[PDB]
Design a protein around this ligand. Structure first.
Ligand code: NA
Lengths: 53, 223
């Protein structure tokens, strides 16, 4: 649940820049460049991005 | 740590930082030459920084020691994060002062309701991104396995405990992993995971240390 761009994520929705969907369940380690998103978007539970996205 | 307060200087003498160019995880000093952390923090090369308070500045109290051996639990599951524990043998014994000390392992498991201290240099904003320079503290109770499971249906093994608030607001966050969860001077948990940070009904999940005491001692005894 969180405002996002033009829209507003409710309940089980995670915000992706300007759209609501995705989910963000992650492990609590720091990702130099954030968690790995690729193909679908948003991020991965426990895998950081060696290089950015 | 979201919704916490700044820990007084050298207030958490057993708190350590795992570094590889920079801070990526926390950890606990269980004895002069060993550190306990989360397995999902594993890396081939790790430098342990002790006696830290302000991770962005050299204060003159810190001790920098590289890890000689890194041992992750044999049964660690990267998908469910079950058995998310790791041992790190320092290449040199640490010097114990007042700014550097060890924490005691569990003589038993904490009962739901037990207040505990959670610390770390993790993200402080639950909605946004904001990393502190000064170690943050948070007092939080140990939730019941029932409420923990209902908060994360099909995800809580018997090697996990929830510590936090069903109402959200205060919780651990990215960068706190591997960190300490001490109750009554005893290390009861390791910052592992959760759904976001400080979300309602989504308290932080932590590794249940009291289940690994035998494993920890036997591993230390053989390395
Ligand atoms: Na420092």
């Amino acid at each position: 649940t969180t405002p996002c761009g033009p829209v507003t994520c409710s309940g089980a929705q995670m915000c992706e820049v300007d759209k609501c969907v995705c989910s963000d369940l992650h492990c609590k380690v720091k990702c130099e460049h954030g968690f790995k998103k690729d193909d679908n978007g948003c991020e991965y539970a426990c895998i950081c991005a060696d290089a950015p996205q | 740590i979201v919704g916490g307060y700044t820990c007084a200087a050298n207030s958490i003498p057993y708190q350590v930082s795992l570094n590889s160019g920079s801070h990526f995880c926390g950890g606990s000093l269980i004895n002069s030459q060993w550190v306990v952390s989360a397995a999902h923090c594993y890396k081939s090369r790790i430098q342990v920084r002790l006696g830290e308070h302000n991770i962005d500045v050299l204060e003159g109290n810190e001790q920098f020691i590289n890890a000689a051996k890194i041992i992750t639990h044999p049964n660690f599951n990267g998908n469910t994060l079950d058995n998310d524990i790791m041992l790190i043998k320092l290449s040199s014994p640490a010097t114990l002062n007042s700014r550097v000390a060890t924490v005691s392992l569990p003589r038993s498991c904490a009962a739901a309701g037990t207040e505990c201290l959670i610390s770390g240099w993790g993200n402080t904003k639950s909605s946004g991104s904001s990393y502190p320079s000064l170690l943050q503290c948070l007092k939080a109770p140990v939730l019941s396995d029932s409420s923990c499971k209902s908060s994360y249906p099909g995800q809580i093994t018997g090697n996990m405990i929830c510590v936090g608030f069903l109402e959200g607001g205060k919780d651990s966050c990215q960068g706190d992993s591997g960190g300490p969860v001490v109750c009554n001077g005893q290390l009861q948990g390791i910052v592992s995971w959760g759904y976001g940070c400080a979300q309602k009904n989504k308290p932080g999940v932590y590794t249940k240390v009291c289940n690994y005491v035998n494993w920890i001692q036997q591993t230390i005894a053989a390395n």
